[PDB]
Design a protein around this ligand. Sequence first.
Ligand SMILES: Cc1cc2c(cc1C)N(C[C@H](O)[C@H](O)[C@H](O)COP(=O)(O)OP(=O)(O)OC[C@H]1O[C@@H](n3cnc4c(N)ncnc43)[C@H](O)[C@@H]1O)c1[nH]c(=O)[nH]c(=O)c1N2
Ligand SMILES: Cc1cc2c(cc1C)N(C[C@H](O)[C@H](O)[C@H](O)COP(=O)(O)OP(=O)(O)OC[C@H]1O[C@@H](n3cnc4c(N)ncnc43)[C@H](O)[C@@H]1O)c1[nH]c(=O)[nH]c(=O)c1N2
Ligand SMILES: N[C@@H](Cc1ccccc1)C(=O)O
Ligand SMILES: N[C@@H](Cc1ccccc1)C(=O)O
Lengths: 537, 528
Amino acid sequence: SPPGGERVGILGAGIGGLYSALILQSLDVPFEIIEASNRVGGRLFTHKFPNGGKYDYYDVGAMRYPLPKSDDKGNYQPGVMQRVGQLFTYLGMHKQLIPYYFKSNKSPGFQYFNGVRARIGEGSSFDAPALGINSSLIDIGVTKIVNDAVGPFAQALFDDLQKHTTTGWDDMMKNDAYSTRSYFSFKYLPSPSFGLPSEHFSTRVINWLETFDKSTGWYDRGLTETVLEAIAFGEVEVDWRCIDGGSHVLPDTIAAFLHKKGGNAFVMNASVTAIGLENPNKEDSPMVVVAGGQKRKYSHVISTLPLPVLRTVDLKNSKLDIVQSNALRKLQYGPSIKIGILFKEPWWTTGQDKNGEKFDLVGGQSYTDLPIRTVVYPSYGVNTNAPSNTLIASYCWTNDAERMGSLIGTGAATYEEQLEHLVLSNLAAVHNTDYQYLKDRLVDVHSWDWNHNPLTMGAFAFFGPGDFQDLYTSLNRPAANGKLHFAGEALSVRHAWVVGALDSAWRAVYNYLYVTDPAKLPKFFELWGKNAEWFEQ
Amino acid sequence: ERVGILGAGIGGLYSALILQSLDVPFEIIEASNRVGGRLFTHKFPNGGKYDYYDVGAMRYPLPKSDDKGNYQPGVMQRVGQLFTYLGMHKQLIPYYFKSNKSPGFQYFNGVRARIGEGSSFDAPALGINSSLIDIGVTKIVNDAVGPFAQALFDDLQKHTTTGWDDMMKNDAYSTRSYFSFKYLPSPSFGLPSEHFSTRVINWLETFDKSTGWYDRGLTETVLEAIAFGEVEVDWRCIDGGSHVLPDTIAAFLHKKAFVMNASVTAIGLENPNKEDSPMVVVAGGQKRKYSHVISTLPLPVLRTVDLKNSKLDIVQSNALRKLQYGPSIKIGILFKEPWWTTGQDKNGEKFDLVGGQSYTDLPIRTVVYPSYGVNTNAPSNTLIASYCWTNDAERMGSLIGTGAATYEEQLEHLVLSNLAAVHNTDYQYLKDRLVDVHSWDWNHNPLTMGAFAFFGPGDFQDLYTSLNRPAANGKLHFAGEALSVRHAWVVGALDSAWRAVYNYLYVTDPAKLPKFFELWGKNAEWFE
Ligand SMILES: Cc1cc2c(cc1C)N(C[C@H](O)[C@H](O)[C@H](O)COP(=O)(O)OP(=O)(O)OC[C@H]1O[C@@H](n3cnc4c(N)ncnc43)[C@H](O)[C@@H]1O)c1[nH]c(=O)[nH]c(=O)c1N2
Ligand SMILES: Cc1cc2c(cc1C)N(C[C@H](O)[C@H](O)[C@H](O)COP(=O)(O)OP(=O)(O)OC[C@H]1O[C@@H](n3cnc4c(N)ncnc43)[C@H](O)[C@@H]1O)c1[nH]c(=O)[nH]c(=O)c1N2
Ligand SMILES: N[C@@H](Cc1ccccc1)C(=O)O
Ligand SMILES: N[C@@H](Cc1ccccc1)C(=O)O
């Protein structure tokens, strides 16, 4: 059935594009990967500090994976991230997965809010009474309040995954015009068991929720993203894992697997500038991709380029319908920054604060309302004879990342100095040290703003209210007479996760096989799942 | 007595003007080597007199004025009075919000038309029924915003606050959630008495504002509609660029100074336990003492300053973080000629554009043709090829200031391609005429950390008032355009300086209040 000249052009050598190639290679479908940069992995990006040891790296993008439980053979239980787990096993990486400590493996991480410092779990109110948060709300806590609001939506979506239905999603979409904030302000009413007034929370209380629940401005994005990310993070049993040597090992291993025999050479350093049918009036017209100044023709094209990147590509002759072209612009992205610092020692593990109290932190995270917002201690290498000296001194989202981004990548020594001093000062206040204690231990600094990077043009999809219900489906349909397939993490309900990109590749390849070679569907299903998301042992 | 003014932008310069007029010693601390802040004029090297463009403030919707520079009551009256005070009234030249000749272009969903030609831009294929198309986005948005704006207008006119109280009961709405859960169309529209769908709301945002605007606070939509006059005004710009305004103030102040190239890193009382404790500002590595401090630093900048010993209360410290800012970018291009005025498209039709603007859903979003110099013997050859807000500015920002030629070339090619599609020319027609490109991302600038305040829902009702109270035992006063209801406008910065100086005089020398009122108004906002 399929014409002898079938060849799928895969745009982007990120995890979505590499996964697409892996599926196609397993089905003996020719492909070619076009990559703008000189590296593979995309937002799987591991920075190694040259002056450091083996574990003196940090992941600028993906770094932690909340996988389902697994057996000794690498078989994963059903779960949100099962597809990621099965990929590791497929590549022979299951035993190379090491623990990721979401919470510290020893003493608890720190919380520093409203000038009040405490350990996670100590039950501090962080001066919330002075904010006007009454004692009833404090006793309940932000976590339980948010879970009561998110739980019902999340439970229906879980039932969808388990029972293979879409009613939970249809119900979510009835409320998708809500932001998390507008949901709390105009619809949510506390559970009767809380004993609170049957009234909507005030803005003061809602902002208290956001402060401790997420990041500045998170609640102005879609309520749907809040429930979906709560599901992904498992905030509603997960095995937190990271990759020994950094997440770059995953795309490196895929590239090696595809390259083993002769080699599926990649077209590197070829930025795509145009995608369209050679002749949109001919039904059998092939696709033409202009990348690096050269025209390359393919029967079908699987794009993993971020939506904002597609907006910089000439899509004339790809015949997007009016909804799809609106979707490329309106489907909202979110920002993020990370700042990694190589120190002379893992002071968070062996050091003490200005009063002699030991931090006693191994992995885990600390949280603060200061500009750095989140501090992440490394879980990799903690038990070796050369533990990591590298800290993620700041990991920000939404407004916090937008503001901090102005100090990153300026190219000016004076702003690098301002940035370092701000970060160290924030770190000192979080951990109760002086600035000089941390300055004396600092060796090198590396910082990254995914919202100032031409190859991503944002950290990841972070939809606003209405995006999922109005525009999302349009990009799950192909364009260019069925020959342009949109993929990438934006094309999932697991935005900002590797599984999102993997799901997007499954759906793109499924559509390609469905319209070009249905005889491969059985093997496609057996190797890569009967469904993108619906569970299955 | 000596007031430390942090920031030599228009808010700090205005604060200095007021203090000088009242014989109050002051000192201005400025991080950079320039005054004006977000009044920032870029002149292209090798270009002519009018081959500049304003990277920040560029247009002023002032009230009517007489031959002597007296301005009628209005939102921007305070700005007009500032021009007159500085002897600049006659240096104000017309700014053409719309083209002075043929109308600008609209390019949406691949459909090109002139402003006013009534195109639907393929909206039926988008699922917008004919009734909504016939009414139009402008009338629909005005019907939803009008009631709120009129009550705030009445506040300014009648000297009341009930309009603001009503706005604040609805401040938890974004514009989108207001349309999705509250707004019901006027019965006169003959539409179903139901809330608009997301598809229709996204159609409104597309033609009304920028990508993501409607997810910000409804109050900002109402306030900006008032400021733009979309609910009359004399649109003006400053001959030679907005930089002339701060340059003229600084020159006036230097005759009677400034601490330049001194970035503020710490603000706090010398001894918070002593009542008479002076303020200490650490700038450029040096400690400077003041009786009171007026800060005009943006809120995100204040978050990078050590405010230990300024004794912010818990609401004020929350406000510095949460009160939301918005992004913006501009791209200026020097061409060999004002092709938008003298040229023709690929089919021989003349653009015939003088000033005004064109709009598109393409990445550049907005094109602004210069109004300065149009009638001289050397008209401007400089175009604002792109001016973006919200998501459009966030996305485009990734291509600006990379320092890499390859991305500078990608940016130029995208901008020219978008321009070509908007105006119906070939790419090479514009490339052959391009001389120089300058681009700026106010959301990638340590001195602003965002373009301007652009509050989310709830910010005005929950956190805004806390920063109008002082900190540091009453000796730290917060100012800057964020401390106003005219965000993203010069008048916003001026209002914040009035309130900051007002509070300063109130606690230190109330006998000067009568003269303060006489020279600078009895109220910040209330009309005369
Ligand atoms: C800061 C941060 C942190 C995290 C994460 C992201 C970020 C930004 N994620 C999310 C995860 O990193 C992300 O969802 C996927 O890696 C995205 O893979 P894609 O293939 O969809 O895009 P991705 O962007 O990775 O790949 C696209 C490719 O296209 C290329 N390209 C761009 N423009 C091009 C052009 N014009 N022509 C050709 N090629 C072009 C790029 O260079 C890149 O190689 C994550 N996930 C997770 O599971 N766990 C985690 O802990 C995290 N944490
Ligand atoms: C793109 C764009 C376009 C427009 C506008 C803004 C922008 C970004 N505006 C809004 C207007 O430009 C703005 O509201 C005011 O200029 C702000 O003046 P401020 O004094 O409040 O701040 P502004 O930011 O101007 O001044 C603050 C000063 O503090 C300095 N500073 C920063 N950090 C410091 C530190 N650590 N130590 C010391 N000094 C420090 C800065 O360098 C600067 O000099 C506008 N308005 C209008 O009326 N018409 C218009 O057309 C426009 N258009
Ligand atoms: N998954 C990534 C990024 C992310 C950001 C925001 C929401 C969800 C995920 C993390 O764990 O940090
Ligand atoms: N006042 C500026 C900036 C602005 C942006 C958004 C709203 C209001 C004002 C302008 O006229 O472009």
